[PDB]
Design a protein around this motif. Sequence first.
Motif, PDB file in Angstrom:
ATOM      1  N   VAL A  92     -33.459  16.353 -43.202  1.00 15.67           N
ATOM      2  CA  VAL A  92     -34.164  16.038 -41.957  1.00 15.67           C
ATOM      3  C   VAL A  92     -34.328  14.527 -41.858  1.00 15.67           C
ATOM      4  O   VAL A  92     -34.752  13.892 -42.833  1.00 15.67           O
ATOM      5  CB  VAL A  92     -35.513  16.739 -41.906  1.00 15.67           C
ATOM      6  N   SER A 130     -37.790  25.349 -47.799  1.00 20.28           N
ATOM      7  CA  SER A 130     -37.795  25.239 -46.344  1.00 20.28           C
ATOM      8  C   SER A 130     -37.743  26.596 -45.651  1.00 20.28           C
ATOM      9  O   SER A 130     -37.653  26.645 -44.423  1.00 20.28           O
ATOM     10  CB  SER A 130     -36.635  24.347 -45.864  1.00 20.28           C
ATOM     11  N   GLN A 189     -34.107  24.513 -39.011  1.00 20.16           N
ATOM     12  CA  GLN A 189     -33.064  25.199 -39.748  1.00 20.16           C
ATOM     13  C   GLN A 189     -33.577  25.445 -41.159  1.00 20.16           C
ATOM     14  O   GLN A 189     -33.817  24.495 -41.908  1.00 20.16           O
ATOM     15  CB  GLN A 189     -31.787  24.356 -39.762  1.00 20.16           C
ATOM     16  N   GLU A 190     -33.745  26.709 -41.531  1.00 21.79           N
ATOM     17  CA  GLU A 190     -34.007  26.991 -42.932  1.00 21.79           C
ATOM     18  C   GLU A 190     -32.778  26.646 -43.763  1.00 21.79           C
ATOM     19  O   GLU A 190     -31.638  26.733 -43.298  1.00 21.79           O
ATOM     20  CB  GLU A 190     -34.380  28.449 -43.139  1.00 21.79           C
ATOM     21  N   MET A 191     -33.016  26.232 -44.998  1.00 20.44           N
ATOM     22  CA  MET A 191     -31.920  25.850 -45.871  1.00 20.44           C
ATOM     23  C   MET A 191     -32.206  26.360 -47.265  1.00 20.44           C
ATOM     24  O   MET A 191     -33.363  26.435 -47.682  1.00 20.44           O
ATOM     25  CB  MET A 191     -31.737  24.342 -45.892  1.00 20.44           C
ATOM     26  N   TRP A 243     -33.492  20.331 -47.328  1.00 20.35           N
ATOM     27  CA  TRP A 243     -34.159  20.047 -46.061  1.00 20.35           C
ATOM     28  C   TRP A 243     -34.943  18.748 -46.133  1.00 20.35           C
ATOM     29  O   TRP A 243     -34.923  17.940 -45.195  1.00 20.35           O
ATOM     30  CB  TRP A 243     -35.081  21.218 -45.725  1.00 20.35           C
ATOM     31  N   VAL A 267     -42.480  19.811 -46.810  1.00 20.13           N
ATOM     32  CA  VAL A 267     -41.734  20.215 -45.622  1.00 20.13           C
ATOM     33  C   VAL A 267     -42.646  20.321 -44.414  1.00 20.13           C
ATOM     34  O   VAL A 267     -42.238  20.015 -43.283  1.00 20.13           O
ATOM     35  CB  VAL A 267     -40.995  21.542 -45.916  1.00 20.13           C
ATOM     36  N   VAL A 315     -31.832  20.119 -37.352  1.00 17.51           N
ATOM     37  CA  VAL A 315     -32.007  20.563 -38.729  1.00 17.51           C
ATOM     38  C   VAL A 315     -33.444  20.926 -39.025  1.00 17.51           C
ATOM     39  O   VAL A 315     -33.707  21.659 -39.984  1.00 17.51           O
ATOM     40  CB  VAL A 315     -31.526  19.498 -39.730  1.00 17.51           C
TER      41      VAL A 315
END
Lengths: 420, 417
Positions: free
Chosen positions: A383, B37, A396-398, A379, B375, A393
Motif C-alpha cells: 500500500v 491484511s 485488497q486482502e493479501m 500489504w 494495517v 491495493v
Amino acid sequence: PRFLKVKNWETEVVLTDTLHLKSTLETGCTEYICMGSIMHPSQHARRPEDVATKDQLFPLAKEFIDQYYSSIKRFGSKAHMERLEEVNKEIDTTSTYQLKDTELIYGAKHAWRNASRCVGRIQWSKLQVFDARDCTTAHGMFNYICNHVKYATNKGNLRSAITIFPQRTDGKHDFRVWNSQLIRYAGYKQPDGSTLGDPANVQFTEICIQQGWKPPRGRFDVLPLLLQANGNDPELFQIPPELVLEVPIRHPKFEWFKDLGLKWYGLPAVSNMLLEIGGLEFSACPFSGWYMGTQIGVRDYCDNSRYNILEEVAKKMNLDMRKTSSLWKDQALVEINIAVLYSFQSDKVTIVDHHSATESFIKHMENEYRCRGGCPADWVWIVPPMSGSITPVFHQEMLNYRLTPSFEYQPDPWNTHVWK
Amino acid sequence: PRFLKVKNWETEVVLTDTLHLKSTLETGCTEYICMGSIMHPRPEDVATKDQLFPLAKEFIDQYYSSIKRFGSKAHMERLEEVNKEIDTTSTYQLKDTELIYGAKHAWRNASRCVGRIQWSKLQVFDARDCTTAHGMFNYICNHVKYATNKGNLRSAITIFPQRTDGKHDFRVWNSQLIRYAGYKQPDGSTLGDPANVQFTEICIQQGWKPPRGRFDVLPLLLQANGNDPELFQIPPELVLEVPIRHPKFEWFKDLGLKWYGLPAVSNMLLEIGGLEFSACPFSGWYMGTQIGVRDYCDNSRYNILEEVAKKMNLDMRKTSSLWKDQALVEINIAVLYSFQSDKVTIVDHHSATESFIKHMENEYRCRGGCPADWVWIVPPMSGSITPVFHQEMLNYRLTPSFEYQPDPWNTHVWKLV
Ligand code: HEM
Ligand code: HEM
Ligand SMILES: C[C@H](O)[C@H](O)[C@H]1CNc2nc(N)[nH]c(=O)c2N1
Ligand SMILES: C[C@H](O)[C@H](O)[C@H]1CNc2nc(N)[nH]c(=O)c2N1
Ligand SMILES: [Zn+2]
C-alpha cells in the motif's frame, strides 16, 4: 490451508491461494502473534551460519534445480538428472556449485517474482540479468556497475536490470556493494547538530569520508561507490557523472517550486540485498527498475539546517503550520508528489505514479493467481505511503509467504567486516 | 519466547513485548503464512459448560489480578460462585465492576483502534436488564444523548443482555447507531450514502417510510431476546450534525454536505470471560479520515471526490496529476475545519497517531505491550508522514475483546408470519 481465499472488498473479487503450500521459510507470525509489520520478522534461513555441509546445501540445490526443470516441462529429463549429478559432484569437490546461465536468469527473475514487498512485479519476467560471477576485484565490480547503470538508465527509458556478482563462499570472501543504493545523495551532519543533504545517508557518507572520500559538501552530492570484492577491504569509486541521470524537480503550477533548486536521480538501484538461489547466496546483486513517484524521498531532503523540504514547500504554499489539523503536511506532500511526477514525465524519465502502479499490481495479482495459484504480497509494503485508501491495493486482502528464490536482507557490511 | 522487540525506525526506540505471552486466541496467521491484511481470518454455538469454565476463570483471574487481589478469599469465592452458576445455569453473570473492567479492556485490547489512549475513560452503560426493543431504543437514545454531550463527545458503551442459547440474541441491526440512508436509483445512480444501500433496503422492507432525501438518518432496527427486529426513529434533536464547509473554498458549502457528529459502532460483539454481548453499541469520536463523505453520491453516479476535483479545476485526465490525492486532502481539511468550527469533537490523523504512539509506549511500560494492527492503525491517507508508519507493531488477540459477528439478517430466524 488446503486453500486460502483473499477478497478485494471494493470489487468483491475473491482469489484462491494454493501457491502458499510451496512456502519454505517462516514468516515470523504464529497462530498467536502476527509480525506483519516487523521489518525483519524472521531469522529463519535455508542454510546454516557458514560453509554448509553437503546435506545442508544439496537438498536446497536439488529443490531449485527440480523447480527450474519443472518450470521448463523437463522434470526428470535427461538434462535434469544430469544436472543433479553435476551439482552433486560440484558440491563434493568444492562445497558449493555454480548455476548455469539459464538457472541464474530463472532464479533472479523468480526472486523478483517472489518479492512480496514489491509493487512493481507485473514486470518480473522482463528483467535483464547481467552475469558478473567472473568478477574478482572492486575495479571489476565498478565496471560491472557502471555498465548496469548505463544499460538500466537507457537515456531515461529505464530498463529493469540486475548485476549478479560472485556468490558467497565461506562468508569471509563476500562481494558487497556497501551502498544501499547504487546512486544516493550524501548526508552531512553539521557542527550545529543538524543535517545537510539527505539525512538517511549520514552514516554511510561518514563511512565514505572516513574511507578517504573528499565530500563536496555541496547540495546533491552523489555518493561514491564503496565496493567490496572477495572479502577484501572496500574501495571507493566515483560513478561518472554522465552516467547519473537526474531530473530537476519543478511543479506544473507553482513556478516557485523550481527555485527550491531540487533534483533527484532517475535510477533507483537497490544494492544491499542478498539474492538466494538454491542455497547459493549472492551478497552483491544490485538491481534496478524505475521509481514509483512516492518513493522519491526528496521530501526529507534538507537544503539548510533548520527546515525541511516538506516544511519549505508548505511555507511557499502559505499553509498554516501551527496546527496539524490544517493538513499542511498532507497538502504539501501531494504537491511534492505532483512535482516529482511532472518533472520525470517532462524529462521523459520512466516513472510510475502510485495509482497506476497499484492498479498494475492488482492486475499482476489476478494473473499470478490465475497462472500460478497465488502471489505472495506484503500489504504493509504494497500500500503506497500516501493516499492509501484511494488506491486499489488498500481493500485488497493479501497473503504473505516466503518463496524461494528470494531477495533477502543482510547485515550492513561495516558491522560485519574485519579490516586489514 | 520470553521477549519480542518492536522498533520504531524513525526514532530508533525499541520496546519489549511480554504481553503477547498472555494471548490465547488465533490471529489467523500460521508459521508460514501471514494473514495480517485479511479482514476476518451457528446460533447453537454457545459455550458448553466445559468450554465456559476456563474462559470464565481466565477472566476472573485477570480481573482480580488487575485489582491486586489475585488468590485472595474474594477472588476464590468469586471463582467458586462463577463455577456454581456455570454448573447450574450453563452461564454466569458479570458483577458490575467486572462488566466495566471488561468493556474497558476490550477497547484497550482492540488492536485495530488508534484511539485507545482514551480506553480507561469509557462510560459503561449496563443495559443487561433490558428485555424489549423499546427498552433498547430508550437505552440507545440515552447513550446518544450522553455521548454527544452537545458536541463535547464522551466515549460510551451500552451493553445489552449477553447471548444465552443463540436463539435469544439482542442485536442492533444497524452497523452504526447513526448512519445516512443510501438509495439506489433505477438509473444506477445512488442517493445518499452508497455504503448503506443494503441496510436501507432492509429498513424499507421492515416498513420504514424513507424520506428519500440526501441525508436521511436511518432508523434504528433493534432486536431483543431473539425476537424480530423493530424499527425506531431516533429523535432528530439527538442527532448532532455538522455542515461541511471549507476554510478556503467558498463553494464547498454549496455541495450541501453534512455529517453526523457521533460515530457509534453497533454491530460488534463484546466478549468477556467467555460471555458474548452481541449488542454493545459503543462510541467515541471521529478521526477526520473516517468520515465517508467523499464516497457520498449527492445527486448522481459521481461522488464528492470527483465533484470536489471538478470544482478545484483539477486535471482529471491522468492519474499522475494526483487530482484524487489533492481533492482527498481538501475534503479532509473541510471535515476537520467544520467539526472544529462547530466545536464538535474530532481528531485529525496526525494528532491521533501521535497520541497512539505515546499510548503504545505507555502500554509497553506499564502493561508489557500493546497489541496493534499496523494495517488498520496507519491512517487511510498520508501514512508515512504519520508516526505509526515507521512504528513496528505486534498484533495478537487479548480477551476481553471486540469481535466481528455475522450480519443478523443472514442468521435471524424470522418469527412473524
Ligand atoms: C520495475 C519497476 C519497480 C517498481 C515500480 C518497484 C516498486 C517497489 C516498491 C514501491 C517497493 C517498496 C519499497 C520502498 O518503498 O522503497 C519495492 C520493494 C522491493 N522491490 Fe520492487 N520495484 C521495481 C523493480 C524491482 C526489481 C527489478 C527488483 C529485483 C529484480 C525488485 C525487487 C524488490 C524487492 C526485493 C523489494 C523489497 C525490498 C525491501 O524489502 O526493502 N523490484 N519495489
Ligand atoms: C474515542 C475516540 C476513538 C477514535 C478516534 C477511534 C478511532 C478508530 C479508528 C480510526 C479505527 C480504525 C477502523 C476505522 O477505520 O474505522 C478504530 C477501530 C476500532 N475501535 Fe476505535 N476509536 C475511538 C473510540 C473507540 C471506543 C470508545 C471503542 C470501544 C469501546 C473502540 C473500539 C474499536 C474497535 C473494536 C475497532 C476495530 C473495528 C473493526 O475491527 O472494524 N474505539 N477506532
Ligand atoms: C514499521 C513498518 O512496518 C516499516 O517501516 C515499513 C512499513 N511499510 C513500508 N512500506 C514501504 N513501501 N516502504 C517502507 O519502508 C515501509 N516501512
Ligand atoms: C484489505 C484490507 O486489509 C482492509 O480493507 C482494511 C485495510 N486497512 C484498513 N484500515 C482502516 N483504518 N480501515 C479500514 O477499513 C481498513 N481496511
Ligand atoms: Zn501475520
